[PDB]
């Protein structure tokens, strides 16, 4: 149901917050340029892909940065100490393999070791001293990601590192490929630094000054053992999730119901999402300048912020379909 090869390219490219230029940036540019009129990279590194059209100016954002680690110190015996880039849980770093990036397109393996707190965590790269670790290319500031790869789980699901929005990056790439003569001036944006504060979405939205804003991200799917039914949030395979509100934004009620009605009309499976906490790019977009009415479509995902996030292709397809239909009909929307 999804373009597996394309999904693999987007999830496996490195790109931690602030360092998206090391891999994911070029993948997004290469895969979207032939479907838009112009592609530009702004000050902070956001990739802005503009598809000219006659209608409301619409910004669709999917963050391309992923959570990771940064080397803070190299111990006398070669072990590495780290700081989190984004909301990383120490429990997900123990007895795990990592890719320690020594240069663009170059990495060496590392092992995470030693509930665990940050001053107890360290990375072993096989060095015997600080000098050897440095000769291997490691320095204070070296970025690290899990050694994760995309794989299939059963008939419709997948496991991978960084679905937390590389699945949304995949989604906008697919939407850009499907969109044909839409009555709207579209700006697809692969935003930077969402994991550290919705930073890229804030600056790109300011520059674009859209009439309507849309974010595509993952949302909590806690439909797992031991979770009370009312706390599951979303269910895998039950459709794209239309966000009503999360801690960072209360989606415009008119857009929420407009999306719900569009889903019903085109027989696209969907579910309604409400989060007690969490934050998404929409949280920044809607507060741009004099205000921007916004909505958000989310891909349900289990085990978010780990090397083993899980999504369902049926929900991904539903998200691509609903966003495409939204762009084709937004010229009629009356707020």
């Amino acid at each position: 149901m999804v373009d597996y090869e394309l999904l693999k390219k987007v999830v496996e490219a490195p790109g931690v917050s602030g360092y998206e230029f090391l891999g994911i940036r070029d993948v997004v540019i290469e895969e979207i340029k032939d479907y838009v009129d112009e592609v530009k990279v702004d000050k902070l590194g956001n990739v802005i892909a503009h598809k000219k059209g006659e209608g409301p100016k619409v910004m669709i954002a999917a963050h391309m940065d992923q959570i990771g680690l940064m080397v803070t110190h190299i111990e006398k015996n070669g072990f590495l100490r780290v700081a989190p880039i984004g909301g990383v849980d120490p429990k997900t770093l123990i007895a795990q393999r990592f890719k320690v990036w020594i240069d663009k397109g170059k990495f060496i393996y590392g092992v995470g070791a030693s509930a665990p707190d940050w001053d107890q965590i360290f990375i072993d790269i096989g060095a015997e001293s600080k000098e050897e670790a440095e000769d291997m290319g490691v320095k204070i500031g070296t970025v690290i990601t899990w050694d994760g790869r995309l794989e299939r789980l059963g008939k419709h699901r997948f496991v991978s590192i960084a679905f937390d929005d590389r699945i949304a990056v995949y989604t906008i790439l697919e939407v850009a490929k499907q969109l044909k003569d839409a009555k709207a001036d579209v700006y697809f944006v692969a935003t930077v630094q969402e994991e550290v504060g919705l930073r890229g979405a804030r600056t790109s939205a300011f520059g674009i000054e859209p009439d309507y804003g849309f974010a595509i991200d993952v949302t909590i799917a806690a439909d797992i053992p031991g979770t009370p039914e009312h706390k599951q949030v979303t269910h895998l395979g039950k459709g794209t999730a239309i966000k009503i509100m999360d801690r960072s934004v209360i989606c415009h009620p008119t857009i929420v119901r407009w999306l719900e009605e569009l889903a019903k009309k085109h027989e696209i499976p969907y579910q309604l999402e409400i989060l007690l906490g969490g934050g998404t790019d929409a949280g920044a977009i809607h507060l741009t300048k004099a205000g921007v009415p916004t909505g958000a479509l989310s891909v349900p995902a289990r085990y978010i912020h780990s090397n083993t996030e899980v999504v369902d292709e049926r929900d991904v397809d539903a998200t691509v379909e609903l966003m495409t239909k939204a762009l084709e009909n937004i010229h009629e929307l009356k707020i």
Binding site: D165, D217, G277, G278, T280, H305
Partner: peptide
């Protein structure tokens, strides 16, 4: 996903 900030937070989770």
């Amino acid at each position: 996903x900030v937070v989770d």
